């Protein structure tokens, strides 16, 4: 059914721009660092550092690679 | 070269963590409300079928999306691997 495939593709694309907001990027980045406080000491002064340094870039790039057509195919909508 | 393996590995770890962190109750609810709002903006025909799809498959679109994220591919595109 081409209509359910279409709707599914709209849905997947909609998720992609919703995580893409800066409000979500901050929530996620803030919620990390906390994961790091579950450590040291030395391995929490380099966990925060690395989250800070690479995190923004990792987040926007993982969104870019999302295949709507693939998500929807593994649901059997497309 | 060994330092490059470290860079690549840290990037991959981050991709897996972040991926886990996105899958939470707040974010899932924001997605559902946005799905609902979006369906109601479509033409009558399509808005109803849009909602049917959200009702059955909506709450697991995020999980399949997160499952398809490739840490290696994200990090190669960053030139970290």
Swiss-Prot record, chain A:
Residues of the full protein shown: 311 to 388 of 524
SS bond partners: 5-78, 8-72, 36-47
Domain of life: Eukaryota
Biological classification of the source: Eukaryota, Metazoa, Chordata, Craniata, Vertebrata
Domain Saposin B-type: 1-78
Residues linked to a glycan: 22
Encoding gene (name): PSAP
The name this protein goes by in its record: Saposin-C
Organism per entry: Homo sapiens
Residue intervals passing through the bilayer: none
